[PDB]
Each structure stands twice: as structure tokens, then as C-alpha cells.
Write an enzyme that holds these catalytic residues in place. Structure first.
Site, PDB file in Angstrom:
ATOM      1  N   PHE B 129       0.855  -1.168   0.000  1.00  0.00           N
ATOM      2  CA  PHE B 129       0.000   0.000   0.000  1.00  0.00           C
ATOM      3  C   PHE B 129       0.895   1.223   0.000  1.00  0.00           C
ATOM      4  CE2 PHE B 129      -4.005   2.027   1.413  1.00  0.00           C
ATOM      5  CZ  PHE B 129      -3.561   3.125   2.138  1.00  0.00           C
ATOM      6  N   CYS B 235      -9.001   2.458   4.448  1.00  0.00           N
ATOM      7  CA  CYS B 235      -8.075   1.335   4.475  1.00  0.00           C
ATOM      8  C   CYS B 235      -7.286   1.404   5.758  1.00  0.00           C
ATOM      9  CB  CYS B 235      -7.116   1.386   3.288  1.00  0.00           C
ATOM     10  SG  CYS B 235      -7.883   1.014   1.717  1.00  0.00           S
ATOM     11  N   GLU B 360       0.409   4.247  10.398  1.00  0.00           N
ATOM     12  CA  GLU B 360      -1.036   4.098  10.523  1.00  0.00           C
ATOM     13  C   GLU B 360      -1.569   5.198  11.440  1.00  0.00           C
ATOM     14  OE1 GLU B 360      -2.935   1.783   9.015  1.00  0.00           O
ATOM     15  OE2 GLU B 360      -1.835  -0.095   8.811  1.00  0.00           O
TER      16      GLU B 360
HETATM   17  C1  LIG Z   1       8.373   0.461   9.466  1.00  0.00           C
HETATM   18  C2  LIG Z   1       7.435   1.429   8.777  1.00  0.00           C
HETATM   19  C3  LIG Z   1       6.536   0.896   7.819  1.00  0.00           C
HETATM   20  C4  LIG Z   1       5.641   1.750   7.123  1.00  0.00           C
HETATM   21  N1  LIG Z   1       4.793   1.228   6.175  1.00  0.00           N
HETATM   22  C5  LIG Z   1       3.936   2.033   5.454  1.00  0.00           C
HETATM   23  C6  LIG Z   1       3.096   1.498   4.455  1.00  0.00           C
HETATM   24  O1  LIG Z   1       3.113   0.276   4.208  1.00  0.00           O
HETATM   25  N2  LIG Z   1       2.268   2.328   3.736  1.00  0.00           N
HETATM   26  C7  LIG Z   1       2.245   3.674   3.978  1.00  0.00           C
HETATM   27  O2  LIG Z   1       1.493   4.406   3.312  1.00  0.00           O
HETATM   28  N3  LIG Z   1       3.052   4.215   4.951  1.00  0.00           N
HETATM   29  C8  LIG Z   1       3.907   3.435   5.701  1.00  0.00           C
HETATM   30  N4  LIG Z   1       4.736   3.980   6.654  1.00  0.00           N
HETATM   31  C9  LIG Z   1       4.679   5.436   6.852  1.00  0.00           C
HETATM   32  C10 LIG Z   1       4.118   5.867   8.176  1.00  0.00           C
HETATM   33  O3  LIG Z   1       2.702   5.862   8.107  1.00  0.00           O
HETATM   34  C11 LIG Z   1       4.700   7.217   8.477  1.00  0.00           C
HETATM   35  O4  LIG Z   1       5.972   7.016   9.087  1.00  0.00           O
HETATM   36  C12 LIG Z   1       3.850   8.071   9.410  1.00  0.00           C
HETATM   37  O5  LIG Z   1       2.787   8.698   8.686  1.00  0.00           O
HETATM   38  C13 LIG Z   1       4.691   9.155  10.054  1.00  0.00           C
HETATM   39  O6  LIG Z   1       4.964  10.173   9.113  1.00  0.00           O
HETATM   40  P1  LIG Z   1       6.452  10.666   8.699  1.00  0.00           P
HETATM   41  O7  LIG Z   1       7.475   9.608   8.975  1.00  0.00           O
HETATM   42  O8  LIG Z   1       6.369  11.177   7.282  1.00  0.00           O
HETATM   43  O9  LIG Z   1       6.726  11.848   9.745  1.00  0.00           O
HETATM   44  P2  LIG Z   1       5.871  13.211   9.893  1.00  0.00           P
HETATM   45  O10 LIG Z   1       4.495  13.026   9.306  1.00  0.00           O
HETATM   46  O11 LIG Z   1       6.764  14.342   9.429  1.00  0.00           O
HETATM   47  O12 LIG Z   1       5.788  13.303  11.509  1.00  0.00           O
HETATM   48  C14 LIG Z   1       6.808  13.548  12.328  1.00  0.00           C
HETATM   49  C15 LIG Z   1       6.512  14.008  13.732  1.00  0.00           C
HETATM   50  O13 LIG Z   1       5.448  15.189  13.693  1.00  0.00           O
HETATM   51  C16 LIG Z   1       4.268  15.030  14.245  1.00  0.00           C
HETATM   52  N5  LIG Z   1       3.185  15.726  13.425  1.00  0.00           N
HETATM   53  C17 LIG Z   1       2.970  15.572  12.128  1.00  0.00           C
HETATM   54  N6  LIG Z   1       1.927  16.404  11.798  1.00  0.00           N
HETATM   55  C18 LIG Z   1       1.522  17.075  12.911  1.00  0.00           C
HETATM   56  C19 LIG Z   1       0.510  18.054  13.189  1.00  0.00           C
HETATM   57  N7  LIG Z   1      -0.315  18.503  12.228  1.00  0.00           N
HETATM   58  N8  LIG Z   1       0.377  18.535  14.469  1.00  0.00           N
HETATM   59  C20 LIG Z   1       1.192  18.100  15.476  1.00  0.00           C
HETATM   60  N9  LIG Z   1       2.167  17.164  15.236  1.00  0.00           N
HETATM   61  C21 LIG Z   1       2.353  16.650  13.964  1.00  0.00           C
HETATM   62  C22 LIG Z   1       3.965  13.556  14.152  1.00  0.00           C
HETATM   63  O14 LIG Z   1       3.154  13.312  15.237  1.00  0.00           O
HETATM   64  C23 LIG Z   1       5.395  12.993  14.327  1.00  0.00           C
HETATM   65  O15 LIG Z   1       5.524  13.123  15.738  1.00  0.00           O
HETATM   66  C24 LIG Z   1       5.625   3.162   7.382  1.00  0.00           C
HETATM   67  C25 LIG Z   1       6.539   3.671   8.365  1.00  0.00           C
HETATM   68  C26 LIG Z   1       7.432   2.833   9.055  1.00  0.00           C
HETATM   69  C27 LIG Z   1       8.359   3.486  10.058  1.00  0.00           C
END
Ligand SMILES: Cc1cc2nc3c(=O)[nH]c(=O)nc-3n(C[C@H](O)[C@H](O)[C@H](O)COP(=O)(O)OP(=O)(O)OC[C@H]3O[C@@H](n4cnc5c(N)ncnc54)[C@H](O)[C@@H]3O)c2cc1C
Ligand SMILES: Cc1cc2nc3c(=O)[nH]c(=O)nc-3n(C[C@H](O)[C@H](O)[C@H](O)COP(=O)(O)OP(=O)(O)OC[C@H]3O[C@@H](n4cnc5c(N)ncnc54)[C@H](O)[C@@H]3O)c2cc1C
Ligand SMILES: Cc1cc2nc3c(=O)[nH]c(=O)nc-3n(C[C@H](O)[C@H](O)[C@H](O)COP(=O)(O)OP(=O)(O)OC[C@H]3O[C@@H](n4cnc5c(N)ncnc54)[C@H](O)[C@@H]3O)c2cc1C
Ligand SMILES: Cc1cc2nc3c(=O)[nH]c(=O)nc-3n(C[C@H](O)[C@H](O)[C@H](O)COP(=O)(O)OP(=O)(O)OC[C@H]3O[C@@H](n4cnc5c(N)ncnc54)[C@H](O)[C@@H]3O)c2cc1C
Lengths: 380, 380, 380, 380
Positions: B129, B235, B360
Site C-alpha cells: 500500500f 483502508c 497508521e
Molecule cells: C516500518 C514502517 C513501515 C511503514 N509502512 C507504510 C506502508 O506500508 N504504507 C504507507 O502508506 N506508509 C507506511 N509507513 C509510513 C508511516 O505511516 C509514516 O511514518 C507516518 O505517517 C509518520 O509520518 P512521517 O514519517 O512522514 O513523519 P511526519 O508526518 O513528518 O511526523 C513527524 C513528527 O510530527 C508530528 N506531526 C505531524 N503532523 C503534525 C501536526 N499537524 N500537528 C502536530 N504534530 C504533527 C507527528 O506526530 C510525528 O511526531 C511506514 C513507516 C514505518 C516506520
């Protein structure tokens, strides 16, 4: 260095240069390799002679024995910079300085002092401190099952989780007959050191299991003044002092990285750094750092004026390491997916601090130390 | 399973046996190896056909499409047992079931459903995904820069941290033209999947970076009903449901190991399990687990009766994962030195949960989901 | 009621009506005055006959005895609504129902039972429960210095913090000779009840001290079956059940008042309800409310089916009261200056919860209860 | 002085003496009545001349204007002792010294300084600071609806929660035309101040509502240098400084009382003080107090050397007040039933601190201050 309440204004020119010096050094020599040394789980031994050339080994000890004779603040400051890179690098210096050089200086014979201190000070001979045994290190005296029977002694027991276990020629072992301390060469027959594998914390460091099977040691190798639990404990108080300082250093590292990341990433249109929930985490990180430096600084002065007590040290170690551990976790949280990889440090420090949070007295034992000091009642 | 409030009394006989069998399979076929696999950072592909055979893949889907057609509680229950071994094993099933099998079923054409669902259900063709992108997965509409331009579509963009990235034949990619969803074969020219290295978390799983360079996809491969951010979000809601369950399983794992350790170790002469400060930790662990199962159970029933809302799911994911992460840390603390080695699971779950705590929807986004729910005001 | 996981769906029609009726009564007849009553620190006795009319007194007991014979969930539900107004009003019903009604029913002679239960249940003869003593209520057996020497028994001892102390005609005194349970009329010479003053908490309730000086009580007035610590203890288990329910009634009260304030007041141009840090406090008061109801609901069913255990009760009282108290504090924080005045309830509940956070087993004793149950080791 | 890290060593003899004296006099003239005064909700005006005589009013101000000209540490030390008795007694001194004396000294004309400062210093004329308004004190520029038109100026608007509001002759009113500051006599026609009743916090203090209806004030009564939000904010910074100190004082008070109680009461045959769970609470209280004194101390020195910044002050107020509020609650918890009555101070301090936790910038506004200072981004 990170310094919100300008505590540097309270340092001497000598103290601030060792800090500036420690940083340029480590920044040239260790930081570019920290990720790879941690990953592979190896301690960089070509750095021992350098630490030594910079006076990191037994810094506060008298130049007579090969020591740098600088202040406790300075020792705290080198620990700060060391840990700011990696706790494993700081661990080596702590062990060598406060767990090996220190007991020899404080409880050794003039022969032992002249004989070992200079080689230890010059990183020419590495040592290790063997106190913790398998039944559990929180009860230093109660679980000490290593025996010593007497003009030569015969040692028999086991030590677990001993830093520098496989690098050392000299092993300060604590056994009972009453607690005594021996300077056990690691090549004397019957002495085996086996490294601990599958470590997910403090990888940039060697941790071993010591097995002493009928190990023979002359009386000339037993620490004369070393009498009772108090001897090894004083060694932990020393080590704990540097640790309260190093903890602040690793905190600067994860904090600095967190705000940079927060400032370069963006979300529903502002920057991560502009969100209230992320700002609160950084604010907490800064607040803890400021609180921690003051405790460390204050303890450094009391130490040199001979008024520092173990309970006081317990307070600073407990508080600072707990804060650093919490801050490392908050930073990994802030980094998101990017934080689960050794590409950022936050998680390396987060894991390393799990160990620091445990050894040299767990969070809970220090709580009890303070508890007993406050109530006069023993609750261990 | 751990059940302080006897919630098993609230399960059907069918649900209770998917739980017993899942633990028998995993216990003889996966737990004996999870260490090594996490350690060498590999996902056990040979277990995918085993999950397929046990009906772990898309358990709630209609037998017509090759699904087991069991309840949501049952799906939650397999996630529970999966995570109890390792979050990576649960992740594969979550992706395949709720991020892949689910999208195709709710938004696919009858052709896409008959064509893919049975192969996916039989673990004969693995999917992934692709929603998250390099600029921030917390704003998935705002940072979605993958484009799609139209009877065939050309896609251009990048996806970061995609589970099953290098195992998948089919990649559910979300891009904009307005959010749309495509079933992109991974071998179509212009599509590259590169694995992420240096992972300290979720090592028993494959994570990749997807790069789509002028990738062409027929309209027959675009999800017809998939319209808007709501499609990929639904999803995640599905996926979040199973995760709220699995979180409770990893909690039973670290808790169970902690009391066993606490009962077998001693200091100052009573067992570690008799100290007020470790009993408080185990007590917290049990309380959280009981609270978590109830949330999970309640949500499972609401789900099958068609009354489950996303905000409700956000509450359960947020609370349960947080608790499991906190409990994993507490357990490592309880294990002392023994907990920093993969000899104990505590730290493997600790690290894994750091990821679950992030993907997620991070802890904070769910907080905002609830916040917006409660106040009607958007604070993201 | 506040019900984010739709638990009202798990309630019978009867249990749902007792709740609607309870709220309608209390809203019209108690809420409008609670502020002045708590202020002048008085308990509204005129409400006792009203509670009786509604069937609040000994709700689950058999109609033969003047009881309403409804379910445990229903008792939990009236407690809920009562506490939602003020803990003091809920306290009266817990004492009368689970600390007075209950022991007479569970361990009383048939003479005591036909005699006392119907009067107590029509709010005609109000009772109390004297277990706690000046040396520490956490050790109810250890600190029980009240003596009973024997066809009549002379009692000597003191009881502290006894609810309904000055309102009761009947006093269930627990003493030793092995714990025995009495049922001492409050007018029998040598029995004095003095009210406690300067109370900051639970002001809408009477708390007294009981001084028994050579009090004479026939054996016909002794609870025949009340044997051992287990008897007064089972009375605490019953009471703690409705408290776990009442706690989530005051939490609905504080949460509701705060989101209303947050949506109505406002700062740098948005409303309070829209800032991330206020949204988070509210999400947390919503999450705990949901967790609490499930614990309470589950316990209610286990109770009626005879499967409820004391350790299970200890868990929900412990969790729910801590949450409701933290929620009350968080709400006062959210109200700002406006919350330090009885104009808002938040602080009245915050102060009351402090008491329920202490009586019927403090947070720590419950932790120990769970601890012993988990490890099998006694750490009190 | 409760002083675990021997900070009294960092104090001058003069500072040390102002502390000894402060404690001796409040110990004889205030402590024995505080319970009662708080109870009947009255501020002991008779103590005002006493404070003046001890030099508590505007202690750091130049003797030229009737000030004691002592150090900031000394001012912090008197605040410490004042709060240690009761926050309301400390509040009067903060208002008079940092919210009234200060602005006149810093922004007043030479005529205003010579005219008011000596009478204020001698507690011959009491003042009050009017900044907060009904719409929200956290946005003081945004919710400042009080207007001033133009040499007479006519003022109209309303101010909330104003300490000394009914005790004052001069009221410093902050209004807009831009932020300006006026020295409004309280008897000038069109100005009214009624008290706030039903206060369950800071009862030993007068809090009023100020209503200015077409109030006339000469230009000779407008603070010349007072320009912008900064002017009143510098006043809060000053006030917040003393508060960070006072907080520590109330902490010593609840802590001291807690260990005494913990030592004198016993349970399953140990003293309460020998339990791991009660020792942990005290340990925490001691750790917090030690951290708080150092922050307070460092800030005092930076202050006198002209290096103190507002953000630095925000850190100390937020940290220390939060810790004191937490400790007061942890103490009431420790006192059990005995803690809900004004017999113990613990709960009086707990309630008082809820106010201190709110005024002069809430916990959250300070968090935002630090946040903005760390990231450079405004998240208010
Ligand atoms: C092992 C692993 C597997 C994954 N697998 C998938 C997958 O299969 N499919 C998929 O689509 N994604 C996947 N991901 C992505 C995962 O969903 C993201 O890591 C997650 O959305 C966190 O976003 P980011 O890493 O881009 O960090 P950011 O979104 O930049 O967030 C970083 C820090 O900021 C904080 N933050 C962000 N926005 C705000 C706000 N508006 N207000 C206050 N605080 C905020 C967050 O809480 C977090 O603390 C995976 C990640 C990992 C680590
Ligand atoms: C990387 C690493 C390096 C190390 N290096 C050295 C070294 O160089 N030299 C050396 O001597 N040791 C060393 N140690 C040992 C370290 O000091 C011990 O791990 C520490 O004492 C913890 O003790 P333990 O592992 O035996 O666990 P235990 O002592 O069994 O403790 C386990 C859990 O119980 C808790 N606990 C224990 N007793 C009580 C009590 N009475 N009341 C309440 N709670 C209690 C502890 O807080 C801990 O939470 C090292 C450890 C590690 C992990
Ligand atoms: C308003 C009010 C109404 C009440 N009504 C009644 C009533 O109707 N009937 C009745 O019988 N009682 C009643 N009580 C008594 C109440 O149950 C007690 O206050 C409670 O048992 C607390 O005990 P204590 O006050 O004696 O304090 P202690 O038992 O001395 O406790 C003090 C502090 O020590 C801690 N502690 C105690 N033992 C241990 C241990 N072994 N290990 C670790 N920590 C420990 C406790 O957690 C608490 O934190 C009432 C109390 C109040 C305040
Ligand atoms: C006993 C007492 C004495 C006082 N004396 C004085 C005095 O002498 N002089 C004077 O000028 N004032 C005085 N005050 C006013 C005091 O400073 C205010 O109560 C304080 O500013 C809190 O503001 P508020 O009551 O208007 O609530 P609000 O400002 O509405 O705040 C309410 C809740 O919202 C939160 N909040 C507000 N803005 C934000 C934001 N942007 N982001 C996130 N959260 C936010 C706050 O943190 C708080 O939690 C006094 C108050 C009390 C209770």
C-alpha cells in the site's frame, strides 16, 4: 554547547578549553564513524591512545601518576562531549578513570599506584571493574558470590556485564572472604573473559562475562585500603558523577537533531516546528537539559571542595539519565519513520541510554538511596 | 491468552478456536526463529503460504473471493497472536488484508476482485500500500505529490516506508490528478522498489521506497469506486482495527516474560516480584491490557454491525499502541542488563512498537482526530 | 449519558430506564443546589427519603427485604448519575447499600434482616460502616484496636472518618476479641459520634469519629455469619463496584463543562477548543471515560453471574478514580482562573475525588492487591 | 531552608539573614493564624505594615525611593518564606513589589516615583495590577478591550481576577488607544471594584473585578515610558521571578509535613515511611525541590548582572510551580483521610498552587514561550 542558563559563565577558562578541545577532537575523530562502529557492534580501540593523548584517562588525577590534574567540572565536561557522540565512548573513559584508575589511587599501595596509574593514564594498559554478578547487581553485597581465600589468594566466582572485559589486562575484582578488592591480571591462569553477544544497546563497547576458576593472586595485588562495600561503591559514586554529565551531552544531541528536523519538515502547511504538540516536546527537552546542567555543575564544585555525598550523586544520575532517556524517546517519536534507522542517532542514543539507565545503579536503587537518606529507613 | 476480565466468555466458539490454532501454528513454526530473523533483518516469506492456509489473509472477506468469511473479532484475534510473536509478522497480514485485500474489495471492479482477491487470499500474490511520501505521512493529502494524468494513466511520484515494497507484485498507489487509487503491477516499466536499510525497528519485515517514473497503467487497473482521501483512509481504519488488537498481544508477551523474570530473580532477599516498585509496573501492565482488550472487543462488535466510526478506531489504536510501547519499556527496565539483548523479546517488541506507534497515524494525529471529533474544530 | 463506544447498547431496557429516571430526578432536585450545600458543608437529609422512593437504597437486594431487586449494572448506573452531581450524594448510597444493607443481608440473622433491611431501604433508618481507625485504614486488620469481649458484648474502641457517623441510628462496628461484625444502635450508652470539621473534600456529606466507651450490645445484635477480615472486606468490594461507576459520572461532568468552556472562550484568534494542547486534554478525558465504562460494565455482568473477584474490583476502582481525578485536575487547568471558584464544579469534583481516591482502599493498596494476585507474593 | 545541595553556600551573609529573619517573623506572626484566615477567606491587612517594616515591599528597589536595595536572591528568599506559609501572603508582596512598585520605578515619571514609591514601600498605600480581562488573560494584547481616549484621558473597560483590587488606592491599568499604562486612583469617580466570592483557592487574599466607567485620569498619571505589551510583560517577568522562588517554599512545607506524617504513622507493621511507594513520592519531592532551588538561584544571579531574559524566567516559573502543585497533591495523597482537612496545610497549599499554576502565565503559555524561543515560530 547547548546552554540556556549560561552556566558556562561559571566555568573557568581551563574548563571551557577542555570542552572546546574535547568537541573538536571527537567531532573530527569519532562522530563520522559512530554509526558504523555501533552497527557492527565494535569498540574503536585506536581511539584509546588518542583519548589518552588528550588526557581523558583519569583527568582529575595528579600529574605525578600521569594524570591531567584538572577539575571535576572538566572531567564532567569531557564525559559530556564523549556521551554527546555515543555513551559507549563515554563508558570506556568512566571505567578507566573512575572504576579502575580511581580505586587504585584511593585504595592501592604506593607500588600499585606507581606501577599501574601511568600506563592506565596513557591508555597503554586497559582495565575493567568486576562487581556485578549473575544473581543481580542491585544487591552489590548480597549477590557477591565470588570468594577469596588466603601470602597469595585464590579467587573463584563469576562477574556479568563487565565493560572492557575483553580489552583489559587488569581486572579490579571484588569478592568476599567481608568485601575486598584485587588487581587481577587477565592472563593469570584460571581467568576467562567471554564477550556478551546479541546486544541491542551500547554496541560501541565491549561487555564480557568474567569467570574466575581458582585464580591465584598475590597479596601485593590486593588493594590494601580497599575494605568493605564502601570501597567499590565509592568507585560507583565517581563513575556516576561523570555519567550525570554525559547524560546531558546525549540530550543536547537528540534535542539539536529534533529541532532541526522539526524545522525542515512541514505538515498541514506550517513546519513541524510550528505545531503545539511538537513544541511542547522540545520545550521539555530544553527544560530538562537546563535542569541537568545545573545539577551537574553544582555537583562538580561540591566534589572538588570535598563536600559531595553519594546521595547527592544518586540524585543527579537518576534525574539526568531518566531525562535523557525520555528525551531520546520523544525525539525518535518526533522523527517518525526516519527515526527507526541509524541514519539519525536519536534511536542509537535511545537504546544506549537504556543501559545507562540500568547500570551504575538503576533508577529504582537511586530512588531508594534518596528514600533512605530522607527517612532514615532502609526500604531496599 | 491473557484475560483478566474473562472476555473470552464473550467470544463465539469459532472465534476462540481461530485464537487457539493461530498460537499453535506460530508457536511451533515462527517463535522458535523470530530472534534470528529479526536479528538478520529478514521477513520469513515461507510463512506467507502458511498464513494463507490458516486463513490469516483477509479473514473477514467473503469465501466467494477466497476469503475465510470469519468475524472481525476473529481477525483481531489472529492479529493478536501474530503481534504477540512479532509486529512484523502482523504487519504483513495487516497490509495484505486491510491495505490491499480491502481496497480491492470495497473499491475495485468486479474484474479486479475476481482477478486479484483469490490469489491474494491464497498468499499466491503479495501486495503493498503506497500512501506515505517523503514530505510527511501525517498529511497524506497535502504531501501527496505523486501525479496521475490520463485510456491509460501515467504515474509519477515517490513513496517512502512502504511495507512489502520488494515482495509485492501489486502496489496500491495513491496519486492525484483529486485522490485516485491504482492497482499498479510492480514489473510495469518505470516502477522501482528499493529496500530501506539500517532499520532498528520492525526488522522482520520488508520496507521499501517506491519510485514511479512515467509508469503507465490502464484505466482497467484504476480502482473505480476509489474517490478522495476517504478511500485510502478507510483502508487505514481497517488496518488500525487489527493493530489495536495485535498491540494487546505484544503486551501479553512482554508482561508474561516480565513477571516470570521478576519471580525468578532475587535481591535483598526476597524475589524481584515481591518489591512494591516492580509489582506496580506489572500491575500497570495488567490494567492496560484489560482496558485494551475491552476497547478491541467493543470495536470488533461495532464493526460487524456496521456502526464502527474512524474516530472510534483512532481511539483504540492510539491508546493500545501507546500502552504496549510503554509496557515494553517498563519490561526492559525490569529485565535490567538482561533486557538489552535479543535473548529476551522485551527489547525486540520495544523497538518494533516504536514503529507501530508511528505508522497508521502517529499518536498525535489520532489525538487530533479525537480532538476534532470532540470540538468540531480542525487543529491539524 | 456520555458514551463514545455505545455501551448503552449493552444495557437492558430496565437498566436504561433507571438511568434516565435517576438523571431526571437529580437534575431537578439536587444539581441546582449542590453548590450551596457543598459550600456550607451540609448533607441534604431531605433527599434520603427521595433516594428511597427511587429505589437507590439497596437496589440489587430482594424485594422481600424492601429491595428493588434490579441488576448490578443498574446499581452501577445510579451510582454513576449520583456521582455525576456530587461524590457526597453517591457516598450516602454506597454506605447504605454496600456497607450497611449488604453485610446485614450477607451475614445477618433472619431477625436482623427482616428487621433492618426494609427500613434502611425506604430511607427510614440510616446506617454507617465503622472499620477505619486512627492508626491507619490501609491495614484494616492490623490497626483494629477496637475490642469486643463477651450473652452481651462490651465494645471499646475508636473509629475515624466514618461516613453517616452523625446521621446513623445503626452503626456496623468491626472489632476483635478474629474480626467480628456488630450493628450497634447509636443511642446505646457509651457510644459517641462527633463530626469532623475543616473538611476541604466531600463537604456535602457527614463524616464522624466514633468513640465506643464500654458499649453494651446483645449477641442478638451481632452479625452471626460475619467472620473474619473477609467479611468487612467483601463489603468494600461491593462499594468499590459502584464507585468505579460513579467515577465515570463525575468525569462526564468535568469533561462536559470543559469542552463547553473551551468552545466558548478564546485566544489569539481561534477558540480554546481548537488549540492542540487543549484538544489533547479533552481527548484524554474522552479516552479514559470509554475505558472506565467498559471496566465497570464488564464487572457488572461478572458480578451478577457470580464470577466477579475482589482483585477484579480493585482494578476498576483504582483505574477509574485515578482517571477521574486527573481529569478533574486537567479540567480545572483548562478553566483557568474561572475554575478556582465553585462557579464551575470542576474544582468541587477535583476536591471530592481526592477522598474517593483515598477511601475504600487507596490507590496504592489496590496496586498491592493486584501485585499479590499477579505474583502470589504479599508486599503490603 | 530545606537544602539538599547546600545552595545556602552560594548565598551572601546578607541574603542568608533576610531569610532567617523572614522565617522567624512569619513563623510568629503568620503561621499560627494562616489556617483560620484561609478558612474565613480573609487577607490579614494588619501584616502589611509588618511586611513594610521588614522591607518586603519592593526589596530590590533603591533606598532613595524607600527601598531596601537588597539583591534579587534576597527578594526570592523572602518570597520563598512567604509562600512556605501561604501563597496569598506571597501574592501581596509580588503585586506590590513587581506589579506595582516596579512599573512605577521602570516607567514612571520622576514625579510619580517620588510621590508613590516611598508610601508603597512603607505599606502606607497598597496597589493592584489590572491587566487580565474577562475574555482571556493568555492573550493580554488581544483581549484588552479597555480603552483610553485623550490632557485628561477617559478610560472604559473591565478587568478580572485582580489581586488587591479591593485593598487598593492606586490601580495600574493597562489599556489601548497601543498599550499604555495608567496610575488610576481607586476613588476617582467611575471606577468600582467588587470582590470575587466563592473562591476555593488563594482564600487568604483579596481578588476583585475592576469596572471602569468613563474614568478620568490626567496625563500626569500615565506612565511616560510605559509603551506596548512589553511594559506590562516586564512586570510579569519580575513577578514570575519571585514566584519561581516561592513555589519552592510551599514545596518545603508540604514535603516536610509529609515525611513527618510518613514517619509517625505505620501499617502492616512498618512505618509508612519504610514503604517503597511512599519513599518514591518523597524522593521525587526532594529531587524537584533541589532542581527548583538551582533554577531560582541561577536566575537570581543572572537577574542582578542584567543578563536575565523572559524566556529564562518562563522556564523557572513553569517548572517550579508545576512541581510544587504535583508535590502538594502527592502529599495530600500521603496524608490520606487526614489530608482533606485544613488541619494539615497540604491541601491548602494544593488549592493555592492551582491558582499560582494559572496566573502570571499558565503552564501552557510558558510552554509556548519556550517553544517560540526554541524554534523561532509562534504557536500561540
Ligand atoms: C516500518 C514502517 C513501515 C511503514 N509502512 C507504510 C506502508 O506500508 N504504507 C504507507 O502508506 N506508509 C507506511 N509507513 C509510513 C508511516 O505511516 C509514516 O511514518 C507516518 O505517517 C509518520 O509520518 P512521517 O514519517 O512522514 O513523519 P511526519 O508526518 O513528518 O511526523 C513527524 C513528527 O510530527 C508530528 N506531526 C505531524 N503532523 C503534525 C501536526 N499537524 N500537528 C502536530 N504534530 C504533527 C507527528 O506526530 C510525528 O511526531 C511506514 C513507516 C514505518 C516506520
Ligand atoms: C551494557 C552494560 C554494561 C555493564 N557494565 C558493568 C561494569 O562494568 N561493572 C559492573 O560491576 N557492572 C556492570 N553492569 C551491570 C549493571 O550495573 C547491572 O545491569 C545493574 O546492576 C542491574 O542489575 P541486574 O542486571 O543484575 O538486574 P537486577 O539487579 O535483578 O534488577 C532488575 C530489575 O529490579 C529492580 N530492583 C532490583 N532490586 C530492587 C529492590 N530492592 N527494590 C525495588 N526494585 C529492585 C531494578 O530496579 C531493576 O529494575 C553492566 C550492565 C550493562 C547492561
Ligand atoms: C471523607 C472520608 C470518608 C471516609 N469514610 C469511611 C467509612 O465510611 N468507613 C470506613 O471504614 N472508612 C472511611 N474512611 C477511611 C478511609 O478508608 C481511609 O482514609 C483510608 O483507609 C486511608 O487510610 P488512612 O487515612 O488511615 O491513611 P493510611 O492508611 O495511614 O495511609 C496513608 C498513606 O500511606 C499509604 N500506605 C498505607 N499502607 C501502605 C503500604 N502497606 N504500602 C505502601 N503504601 C501504604 C497509603 O497509600 C496512603 O498513601 C473515610 C475517609 C475519608 C477521607
Ligand atoms: C487568584 C487569581 C488572582 C489573579 N490576579 C491577577 C492580577 O493581580 N493581575 C492580573 O492581570 N491577572 C490576575 N489574574 C488573572 C490570571 O493571570 C488569569 O487567570 C490567567 O491569565 C488565566 O487566564 P484566563 O483565566 O482568562 O483563562 P484563559 O486565558 O481563557 O485560559 C484557559 C485555558 O486555556 C489555555 N490557553 C489559553 N490560550 C492558549 C493558547 N493560545 N494555546 C493553548 N492553550 C491556551 C490556558 O492554558 C488555560 O489552560 C488572577 C487569577 C487568579 C485565578
Amino acid at each position: 554547547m547547548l546552554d540556556f542558563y549560561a552556566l558556562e559563565d561559571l566555568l573557568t577558562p581551563e574548563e571551557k578549553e577542555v570542552q572546546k578541545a574535547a568537541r573538536r577532537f571527537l567531532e573530527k575523530e569519532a562522530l563520522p564513524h559512530i554509526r558504523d562502529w555501533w552497527e557492527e557492534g565494535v569498540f574503536p580501540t585506536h581511539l584509546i591512545p588518542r583519548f589518552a593523548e588528550l588526557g581523558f584517562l583519569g583527568p582529575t588525577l595528579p600529574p605525578e601518576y600521569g594524570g591531567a590534574g584538572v577539575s571535576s567540572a572538566a572531567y564532567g565536561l569531557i564525559c559530556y562531549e564523549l556521551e554527546r557522540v555515543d555513551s559507549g565512548l563515554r563508558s570506556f573513559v568512566s571505567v578507566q578513570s573512575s572504576l579502575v584508575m580511581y580505586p587504585i589511587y584511593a585504595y592501592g599501595s604506593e607500588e600499585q599506584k606507581r606501577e599501574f596509574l601511568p600506563k592506565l593514564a596513557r591508555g597503554e594498559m586497559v582495565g575493567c571493574f568486576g562487581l556485578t554478578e549473575p544473581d543481580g547487581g542491585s544487591d552489590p553485597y548480597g549477590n557477591m558470590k565470588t570468594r577469596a581465600r588466603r601470602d597469595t589468594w585464590v579467587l573463584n566466582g563469576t562477574k556479568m556485564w563487565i565493560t572492557n572485559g575483553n580489552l583489559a589486562h587488569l581486572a579490579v575484582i571484588w569478592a568476599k572472604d567481608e568485601v575486598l578488592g584485587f588487581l587481577v591480571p587477565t592472563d593469570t591462569p584460571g581467568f576467562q573473559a567471554r564477550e556478551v553477544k546479541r546486544k541491542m544497546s551500547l554496541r560501541a563497547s565491549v561487555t564480557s562475562e568474567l569467570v574466575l576458576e581458582e585464580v591465584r593472586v598475590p597479596e601485593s595485588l590486593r588493594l590494601p585500603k580497599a575494605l568493605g562495600l564502601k570501597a567499590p561503591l565509592s568507585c560507583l559514586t565517581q563513575a556516576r558523577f561523570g555519567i550525570a554529565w554525559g547524560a546531558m551531552g546525549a540530550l543536547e544531541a537528540v534535542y539539536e537533531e529534533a529541532v532541526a528536523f522539526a524545522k525542515s519538515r512541514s505538515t498541514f502547511g506550517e513546519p513541524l516546528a510550528k505545531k503545539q504538540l511538537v513544541q511542547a516536546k522540545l520545550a521539555e527537552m530544553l527544560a530538562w537539559h537546563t535542569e541537568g546542567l545545573l545539577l551537574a555543575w553544582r555537583l562538580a564544585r561540591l566534589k572538588d571542595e570535598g563536600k559531595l555525598t553519594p546521595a547527592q550523586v544518586s540524585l543527579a544520575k537518576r534525574q539526568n539519565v531518566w531525562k535523557a532517556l525520555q528525551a531520546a524517546r520523544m525525539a525518535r517519536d518526533i522523527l517518525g519513520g526516519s527515526g527507526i534507522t541509524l541514519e539519525y542517532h536519536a534511536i542509537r542514543h535511545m537504546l544506549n541510554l537504556e543501559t545507562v539507565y540500568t547500570y551504575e545503579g538503576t533508577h529504582d536503587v537511586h530512588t531508594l538511596v534518596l528514600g533512605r537518606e530522607i527517612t532514615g529507613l532502609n526500604a531496599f
